[PDB]
């Protein structure tokens, strides 16, 4: 009966039914996004109203609509026609992916370009890539994808080994017209294959790995009820799933004695962007908002046992809508398991004679998605000691180009003639905080060095300072690793036994933020990515740091517009938005398939508890 | 037959025998340090000469000696009398620990101080703490320990809950005299117990944790030969152990096809210091060089199976000397196991139809040591993909004080009246590099932002720059997290298939370095801790960043003196010294026993290999 339960197949077909009955889902309509809305604040008292939000595209060229449906009541709550030139195009549709290659294959300009390179059109794959917003005035209000070409020598060949540089095309996927074909000159198409299952390249497979077996003879220590409610080692939460954000955690709380204490109301990765740093006009427009433009949840992998997820795994199989409003299950799309995490606490005391050791564990909730060449794992971790962590695991195949004769300041060489343009992968975690409830505030904490002198005659003292962020105008913050900067979210009305406000401290990795010039299109479209930490006052319509419609949408929406309201955040219902990412200068070791690299953040209790919360963990 | 084999009990008793025969180890002599020396450069050609270095203390007050013995040849190579006022006192002896409490228990000043606080002397434990170098001229050339008092209410009580603030004593442990007793005034001795095995404090232990079983039905994938030579998944190394440094890795190399390629010649934690940031005269002298002053290897725990180390564990049991030169085994003092490390690489390709997933693993080599209240785990990790990592796990019981009425800028409150002074734990990793051999150099790599303009019209380009550190005077470097600063160690004479020098990139955590005023005693004694990265030219006598004798030793030795030589490091046999640490403002959650916190660093291949080194890893 939980209002935070996953969407069921039945609910999706019912949204379809309601939209049809209302005249909003005829044969020319396509669902570009569909997801359940979270309950309103204070809704617990009233009965359930399961509401769904839908973006409806029209293949005949009519204006799309944003629609909210009550599936409980069988009604349309609201429907509004969108002006996409103003507020943004709808997310890329799965069905549009094939269209770029298909249209290009009979375009005379494209064919001339392929013929100049002696490339068989039947062997040329075209990546359907988001277009962004640049200088092409004809694209405003049109659904455009840009195409970069890669040669596939045979059906099982990795096309990424054979980029066709110097060539890019722009296509209108609604009118089905090729708008531009740009050919800046021929580059050699790299010839070596990148087939990482071919014995010629791998050599003989290792026979040296002996089995590791991880089992739980009594089953897992967590329970799942109501489909998605998890209880594990004092933690309580609901695991949601949304086609845009992927796995979303709701109602993260910790049972401290007899009281269920909220910590985070909602945690998600609300955006991720991959800006490229190659100034070639073939790629200088490239910025993939995997979450906002493509919808990472839609491409979640079905995860195989003993392969993607090892141990005693409990799976969830979230349901999403296809383009027509029919439910589609992502079988085994979410993994849940607990795992050992080494030593938790240890002391061998000389005076008491007591030797004490306890083991740590973490609950893991994850999914893996594939967006073209990229594959990303999204992992949430809950630890015995109250720590909450996120980790992103980046792998897949690097996006390639030619490697220029004479080298490049913006591209690395992977193989003979084969380049990998420099890029970043930058995430935004949206943390709707509820430290002991909704009345929260954020302080920035810096280490403070002290001068040798009176009060500090030996020059050993050091301290720290905390600055409360009182209003949104003061809440756009940068990292300072040198001063050990962190941010504490506390509840000023909830004190621990030592009369101090309870809190959690956010520890960032302090990786570089968005590198692009601040006057670039990407600095405006991904403004969030220019600063490490933002704090807003909660509002129901402030969901994504880039706004609701990212595809081909200029600046104007998202975090910079939210904070202009300059609202009170000092003891209020607030949301922390943390930017973190990887800056990738690809190495030869990343080719032909990339070993995982990671980035993330964590939050640790900071006077939240009255003493260690793991004193009751048993030995051995 | 390996010259890198662990010291045997037989070798230690033979050093004892040689020293005795030579007249250097009579009844008043005590061994304060004993360890095997590494083979000289180019020694492989010649037959083994196992040499041991020994620091010999004299309990009658005679000058100590530094002695080198050839155990192979049964000879004393060299013996030199030390002037400790100049070059430093010998490491603290285990036998001196009890002496501080014992002497103080019949000192009238100490007894007066305890009586003023109504404390039974039989219940007062005294910590034997390193003294450092301050303003007390009488201490120069004398072996001093300082004592801080903690009340133990009964034999099994945790004394750390009951610090006796406002009181400190200084003791000469050779002449066995109390030099000073300082009483700045009474503070309340905190009364709450910190007994983390007492059911009153823990409450009922959890019954919710179900077993996790980790087994290897065919045994481990690594082999051990010659006692300490490890071969695992293309890696090759020797696991050494030294009473000062603890676990030391030698000859880390990777088998790439048919060639065994060196990476690191020697890896160790060559120092660790814990500076305290409380300006109270009771603690303002407190800086524990756990490695240099106490010898972390000497206090390595015997690690219990399924408790400290989980899985299919192979143990080593290193042998050290006691104070008289008799061998003592640390049973199960080193853990070795491999463990699963999630996904290694993954891609689901739309064009080829090939779905590919591979699992990662790491080899773990660790030990755990206890120094008073502190317990530290030292972990070395080798990954399938060529990554090398170190991690330190800090736990134990926090060092306590009174919490002042009216608060403190330098102490946090843990419990009523109970304080925890702010401090850091700072490590120095000494990495004697051998990237494809000994001809190495280091570059500092920064991300480079680019301005929108000609050549970069869209303002998206970014790049990087590398600066070769050519001489030691230019090789003292600081972190810059904002610019993504790393350091690459390469071999300029060994190129990969793309004609680029092979390399490894060091990724630091960029935590704060030493906070103390640069004119303090600790900034001089722990000068290494003020900068993130140092590079020296290799020399056999440059072992520790603080020199050979740290105890009561001023500046004058260590890294600052080594780099003054301004030697060539551009394509030479070099050593990287990386400073990294934790800055600890204790939280209520750290009490009464601290959950593990971590810090470390890693090195990843950077064009070392000609493509991914894990293409030959099998499925499932
Ligand atoms: C942003 N960037 C840089 C980017 C760069 C490049 C691309 C891009 O776009 C985003 C892509 C989203 C993630 C990536 C796409 C998201 C998933 C959508 C999906 C699918 C898609 C595309 C396919 C395909 C598929 N299949 Ru498949 N197959 C073949 C050829 C092309 N298939 C589909 C339709 C018709 C025929 C087939 C077919 C025929 C024989 C063998 C395999 N297939 N298929 C069918 C049945 C069972 C299993 C499969 C299967 C299994 C693995 C791979 C392909 N197919 C399943 C699901 C973005
Ligand atoms: C730098 N800082 C901040 C610092 C702060 C505070 C202290 C300090 O100093 C560094 C300490 C080094 C690590 C810390 C010290 C390094 C280890 C040296 C060791 C031992 C040491 C001190 C003991 C003791 C010991 N024992 Ru234990 N015992 C009792 C009382 C005090 N013992 C030793 C001698 C005589 C009698 C006993 C005895 C009697 C009954 C029960 C237990 N003991 N002992 C004996 C046999 C078997 C097992 C034990 C045993 C097991 C656990 C704890 C104690 N004993 C074993 C090893 C440094
Ligand atoms: Cu990347
Ligand atoms: Cu600490
Ligand atoms: Na909130
Ligand atoms: Na070297």
Swiss-Prot record, chains A, B:
One of the protein's GO biological processes: amine metabolic process
Record keywords, A-Z: Copper, Disulfide bond, Metal-binding, Oxidoreductase, TPQ
Binding annotation for Cu cation: 423, 425, 584
Stated consequence of mutating residue 374 to F: Loss of activity
Source organism, top-level taxon: Bacteria
Amino-acid positions noted as binding substrate in the UniProt annotation, renumbered to this chain: 288-299, 371-376
Catalytic activity of the protein: a primary methyl amine + O2 + H2O = an aldehyde + H2O2 + NH4(+); 2-phenylethylamine + O2 + H2O = 2-phenylacetaldehyde + H2O2 + NH4(+)
Swiss-Prot/TrEMBL cofactor(s): Cu cation; L-topaquinone
Active-site residues from the entry: 290, 374
Key word Oxidoreductase present: yes
One example GO MF annotation: primary methylamine oxidase activity
PTM section of the record: Topaquinone (TPQ) is generated by copper-dependent autoxidation of a specific tyrosyl residue.
Subunit structure: Homodimer.
Family classification: Belongs to the copper/topaquinone oxidase family.
Protein name per UniProt: Phenylethylamine oxidase
Organism: Arthrobacter globiformis
């Amino acid at each position: 009966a939980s209002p935070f339960r996953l969407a069921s197949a039945g609910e999706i077909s019912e949204v379809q039914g309601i939209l049809r009955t209302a005249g909003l889902l005829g044969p020319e309509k396509r669902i570009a996004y569909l997801g359940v809305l979270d309950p309103a604040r204070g809704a617990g008292s009233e009965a359930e109203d399961r509401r769904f939000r839908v973006f409806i595209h029209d293949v005949s060229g009519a204006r799309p609509q944003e629609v909210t449906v009550s599936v409980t009541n069988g009604t349309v709550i609201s429907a509004v026609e969108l002006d996409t030139a103003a507020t943004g195009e709808l997310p890329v549709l799965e069905e549009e992916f094939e269209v770029v290659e298909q249209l290009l294959a009979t375009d005379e300009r494209w064919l001339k370009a392929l013929a100049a390179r002696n490339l068989d059109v039947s062997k040329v794959r075209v990546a359907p890539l988001s277009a962004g917003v640049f200088e092409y005035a004809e694209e405003r209000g049109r659904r455009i994808l840009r195409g970069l070409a890669f040669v596939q020598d045979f059906p099982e060949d990795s096309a990424w080994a054979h980029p066709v540089d110097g060539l890019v095309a722009y296509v209108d996927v609604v009118s089905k017209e090729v708008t531009r074909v740009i050919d800046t000159g021929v580059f050699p198409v790299p010839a070596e294959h990148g087939n990482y299952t071919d014995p010629e390249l791998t050599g003989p497979l290792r026979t040296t790995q002996k089995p590791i077996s991880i089992t739980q003879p009594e089953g897992p220590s967590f329970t799942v009820t109501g489909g998605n409610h998890i209880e594990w080692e004092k933690w309580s939460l609901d695991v949601g799933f949304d086609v845009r954000e992927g796995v979303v955690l709701h109602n993260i709380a910790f049972r401290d004695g007899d009281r269920l204490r909220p910590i985070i109301n909602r945690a998600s990765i609300a955006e991720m962007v991959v800006p490229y740093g190659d100034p070639s006009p073939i790629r200088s427009w490239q910025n993939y908002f995997d979450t906002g433009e493509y919808l990472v949840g839609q491409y979640a992998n079905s995860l195989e046992l003993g392969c993607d997820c090892l141990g005693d795994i409990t799976y969830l199989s979230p349901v999403i809508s296809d383009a027509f409003g029919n439910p589609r299950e992502i079988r085994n799309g979410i993994c849940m398991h607990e795992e050992d995490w080494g030593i938790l606490a240890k002391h061998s005391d000389l005076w008491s004679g007591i030797n004490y050791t306890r083991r740590n564990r973490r609950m893991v909730i994850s999914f893996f998605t594939t967006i073209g060449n990229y594959d990303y794992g999204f992992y949430w971790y809950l630890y015995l000691d109250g720590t909450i962590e996120f980790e992103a695991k980046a792998t897949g195949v690097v996006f390639t180009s030619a490697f220029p004769e004479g080298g490049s300041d913006n591209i690395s060489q992977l193989a003979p003639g084969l380049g990998a343009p420099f890029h970043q992968h930058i995430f935004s975690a949206r943390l709707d905080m509820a430290i002991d409830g909704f009345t929260n505030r954020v302080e920035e904490e810096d280490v403070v060095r002290q001068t040798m002198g009176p009060g500090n005659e030996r020059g050993n003292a050091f301290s720290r300072k905390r600055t409360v962020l009182t209003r949104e105008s003061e809440a756009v913050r940068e990292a300072d690793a040198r001063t050990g900067r962190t941010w504490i979210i506390s509840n000023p009305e909830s004190k621990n036994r030592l009369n101090e406000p309870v809190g959690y401290k956010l520890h960032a990795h302090n990786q570089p933020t968005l590198l692009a010039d601040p006057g670039s299109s990407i600095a405006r479209r991904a403004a969030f990515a220019t600063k490490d930490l933002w704090v807003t006052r909660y509002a129901d319509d402030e969901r994504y740091p880039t706004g609701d419609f990212v595809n081909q949408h200029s600046g104007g929406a998202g975090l910079p517009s939210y904070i202009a309201q300059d609202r009170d955040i000092d003891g209020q219902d607030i949301v922390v938005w943390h930017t973190f990412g990887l800056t990738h200068f690809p190495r030869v070791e990343d080719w032909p398939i990339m070993p995982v690299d990671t980035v993330g953040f964590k939050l640790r209790p900071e006077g939240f508890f009255d003493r260690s919360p793991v004193l009751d963990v048993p030995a051995n």
